[PDB]
Design a protein around this ligand. Structure first.
Ligand SMILES: CN1CCN(C(=O)Nc2ccc(F)cc2)CC1
Length: 284
């Protein structure tokens, strides 16, 4: 029974390797990775792979791995797929831990923009969780953490992490990880999956997919929002993506809104993540 080697980049940056039968569905690999991670609250997570265009795609757990990775390597990342709006409602501390690891990469990568002060506060909770109580012996006036806190590190930011770390004496890792999440969850781009697009006029916009709905960023001023309940149908056709809005009160007709994506693959990818978010966040 022929098996393919799988390599999975974990959220701590280490690599998990296993074998699966070459006709295996994504769920088989996902279950192995989650068992490795001692993760029970699996519904928030997924595996990603890179397609022939180097775009990130979710591995569909219901479909054969081979039919998704096609010509590419059996190389994956383990990621948060659905960011919980209220991480305090998760059952297990270990779930919150993996969500913290993801958010730390979202911040360092610049996917999740963050003020100086919030970068320093999030850093201070990570330091408290991972080293415990502040110790002056380790950190002199010239201290620079090994910890990556931001897309760009400054001495000022390092100083502020240390100043806030001092305030967290007695804080336990789950407690510090919960404070991390109570701050991160409020950030305007928390759990927003962004897609480059053009409006029905050719104006370059961003489409954001998240728990609360579909966001349209037409620049720093003029952000439109479509809550998931207000969306009856998501469709794609060639390079175009469409949302069918419920009729407003006393309105005769549904309304359909159309966008232009980079290519057909990008339209199908945006369609699939919207359908998935709509289904996931509808239920809980
Ligand atoms: C396999 N499904 C996954 C979706 N669904 C669920 O509970 N979603 C959810 C929404 C929002 C939240 F914050 C947590 C979970 C039930 C089982």
């Amino acid at each position: 029974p022929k098996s393919m080697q799988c390599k999975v980049i974990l959220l701590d940056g280490s690599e998990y390797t296993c074998d699966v039968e070459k006709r295996s569905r994504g769920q088989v690999l996902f279950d192995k990775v989650c068992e490795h991670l001692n993760l029970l609250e699996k519904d928030y997570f997924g595996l990603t792979y890179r397609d022939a265009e180097n775009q990130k795609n979710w591995l569909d757990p219901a479909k054969e791995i081979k039919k998704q990775v096609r010509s590419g390597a059996w190389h994956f990342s383990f990621n948060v797929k659905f960011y919980p709006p209220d991480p305090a409602q998760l059952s297990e501390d270990i779930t919150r831990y993996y969500l913290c690891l993801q958010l730390r990469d979202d911040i360092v990568s610049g996917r999740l923009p963050c003020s100086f002060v919030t970068l320093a506060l999030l850093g201070s909770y990570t330091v408290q969780s991972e080293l415990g109580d502040y110790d002056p012996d380790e950190c002199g006036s010239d201290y620079i953490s090994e910890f990556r806190f931001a897309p760009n590190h400054t001495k000022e930011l390092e100083d502020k992490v240390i100043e806030l770390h001092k305030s967290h004496r007695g804080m336990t890792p789950a407690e510090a990880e919960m404070h991390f999440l109570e701050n991160a969850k409020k950030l305007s781009m928390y759990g927003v999956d962004l897609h480059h697009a053009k409006d029905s006029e050719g104006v370059e916009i961003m489409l954001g997919v998240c728990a609360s709905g579909l966001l349209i960023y037409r620049d720093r001023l003029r952000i439109n929002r479509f809550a998931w309940p207000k969306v009856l149908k998501i469709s794609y056709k060639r390079n175009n993506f469409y949302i069918k809005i419920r009729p407003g009160e006393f309105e005769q007709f549904e309304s359909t809104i159309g966008f232009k994506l980079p290519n057909h693959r990008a339209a199908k990818r945006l369609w699939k993540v919207c359908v998935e978010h709509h289904t996931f966040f509808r239920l809980l």
